[model samples]
Target: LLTAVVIILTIAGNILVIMAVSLEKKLQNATNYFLMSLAIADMLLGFLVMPVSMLTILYGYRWPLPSKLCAVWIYLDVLFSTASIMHLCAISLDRYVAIQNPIHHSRFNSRTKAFLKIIAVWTISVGISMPIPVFGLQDDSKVFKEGSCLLADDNFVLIGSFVSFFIPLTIMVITYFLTIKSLQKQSISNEQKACKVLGIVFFLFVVMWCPFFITNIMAVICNEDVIGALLNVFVWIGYLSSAVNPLVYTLFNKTYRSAFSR
Candidate 1:
């Protein structure tokens, strides 16, 4: 019941964000292009991932599907999450460039470039995640009692964390730090405030995701029991992140406020 409510609220909130952005022409700019992608990613997580995840948690991680479906689920779990993190990184870069060099930012605002970036995010995510099946990195055995498919071994976990979480997270941190530094040097008050708001949003993204990333990396290095407990905590933190985003944006951004009021 709790999980159902959480998933419902998350989906509704993300859907509202999508609707607001689509309806408000003023909100349709280069920065918002990445936001749209983020919203779609969150929407998928709420609808596809969270419901099943909630079921697993409630039912002790026992997936009721066959091996093939389990593989596909695990693939999507990694794929969507990778896409989400990559999109966040892309957004951070976009904001950084827009704030630091407003004139050159127009180049990235082109329809062609935006489409390409979105495509690239998905392509890269899928490219990294698809290897799990090919490389036999997914455990097919049903011996584990908490029966959900996961990365087969420690090596796979290590590689997966490095590829999917660590690398992207590093980029996001570097780019966001630079972005904040650039904002600090700006003279315009309104621009600075906008940049600050973006920074805060990005920071929240980091806080929400960092625990999960760290837990995964540690799990690679440690034993299963420790990893499992940490994973539970981090997974909840990740879900909480999604729910917080729309609220933060709505509270901080006047454009979002105006759109919501309309």
Candidate 2:
């Protein structure tokens, strides 16, 4: 019952963001463009990935399909997860530049440039996740372990966690802090409000995901002695992050909150 609720909400909310950004004239800005792509990743995770993950749990954490499909599933998992964080990192960095230099930033705020930056974000995410399938497909053991589909390469987990989550998280934190510091010197304006909205989103994301990565790294460092049930709890917590961004936007942004009504 809980799984069904999460899946439905994640799909519906992210689709709402995608539609609002694409169809609403007021939402066609560069920031919204990044948001639309982020929504794309979140919505895909809801539609394509979460169901399978739920099934795995139902079947006692076992990979139900042929081993090859596990590779693809894990690949998609890593790809979307990485893309989500990278989008946040890019948004923070973009906000910093825009806040730092308004006129020069305003002149170059074209859709083409935004699209190019989005492309680069996705490309880097794909690159970081590409190794999963390369290693998984070649050896079933890399992903399929003791009847479970898990990324079992200790080295990959350590390296991938840092590259995919921690590093981007650090960059996002620093950029967000700098953006807020600059806002402190100025009057509370539209830009500052937007930063607060994104700041809340970033804060929630870190809260949701921080445990999973920390536990993941700890599992590696502690020689794989982490509790399985605790890990599963953290995994669901991380997945829940995908469902809450739309709600946050609605709560924090007046325009977004009214879009559904209008």
Candidate 3:
């Protein structure tokens, strides 16, 4: 029941985000395109990744599907999550650049160029996660935890977590603070509204996912059974971020809130 609720909410809310960006003229700008791309990643997570995860949990963490399919599942899971953080990092940098050079910002606002950047984000995510299937399908021991399809390579866990989550998180925070500082200096009313929306989005993302990555590292270095237990809890909390993003957009951005109403 819990998994169903999360999966449904993630899919439903992100779909609304995609629809709003696609159909609403007000949301057709470059910044909104990042949201649309992020929604695509999250929605795909709900549709293609989370359902199979629910099956694994229901089946007592033992992968019910064929071993090869398990590799595909893990691949998509990492792919979506990496893409999400990458998008967030990119958005902060993009906003900062826009604020710093409001004149040249128009050059950055082209739809085709925004689409190209979104493609680059996905490509980088793919590069980071592409090794999963190579190692996972080749050796069951790398992916199967007792009977569960959990990543088992300690080195991979440490390095992958840093590259995929931690590094981007650092870049995101620095860029975000710089952007906000610049905005404060200018103190423009309209940009302040967008800055608040941006701030809440990044804040919630960190709150939601920080526990998972921290516990992920602990699971590697400390090797505690308690950490293992907490890992599951944190993983779901991370997944919940996918659903929470659309809510943040609706609550914080009147453009999207009104778009949803229409």
Candidate 4:
């Protein structure tokens, strides 16, 4: 029932975001394009990915399908979730441009470019996710072996640490901090509020993912025996960021909060 509720909430919330942004004239802007794409990613996660993940957890890390289907599950799972991460990265860049270069932001806020950027996010997400199975990084454990998955070995984990977690996080942190540094001398009633909102959202994003990534890296390096027991926990916890987006992102803004309140 817990999983069922999560599945429902995730679908309903993100779909509302999509409908609002698509139909509401005020929300049809470059930033909203990024946001719309993010919503779709989150929505897809709720619809396509999370069920598989939840089942995997229920089975105690055992896959419920044939080897190839198991691989498909791993691929789709990584692709959508990683796309969610890439969308956050793209959102950071959007906020940076809007804050630091408002005028240029205006000139280049074309839908074409925004669409291209969204496509690029999807493209990069697939590129990063598909290779794991192709490279035979997936767990090759015999059928019915317990706790088996698209497992990574030592070196894959190291390189994956850079690709999956460190690099985007570094860029996100740098871009977020750059926005702060750029605003060091500036002040506005609304800009200050906006910064606070963005900072809080990004901070929450990292908080959800940080421990998951940190423990993953540690598990890889230290060869911790507890990894099998805990990795799925982190996976589920980290995906909660999907709900966090709509929960926190817009509810703080009066207009969004009242879209339904009205």
TM-score of each: 0.86, 0.92, 0.92, 0.88
> Over the stretch 175-195, how does candidate 2's per-residue lDDT look in tens digits?
878888877765567766776
lDDT by residue (63-102, candidate 4, tens digit) is 7766566656666777877888888888888878877988
Q: Write candidate 1's Cα lDDT for 53-72 as tens digits.
A: 77777767776655466666
Candidate 1 has which clashing residue pairs, if any?
Answer: none
Q: Which ten-residue region of model 2 has the weakest summed lDDT? A: 221-230
lDDT of each: 0.74, 0.83, 0.84, 0.75
What tens-digit string does per-residue lDDT give for candidate 3 at 10-128? 99899888888898887776778788888988899889998887888888777775777877888889999998888878877787888889889876568787888888898899899
Ranking by TM-score: 2, 3, 4, 1
Model 4 per-residue lDDT at 65: 61
The global Cα lDDT (0 to 1) of model 3 is 0.84
Pick out the ten consecutive residues of candidate 1 with the lowest summed lDDT. Answer: 137-146
Superposed Cα deviation of residue 259, candidate 2 (Å): 2.4
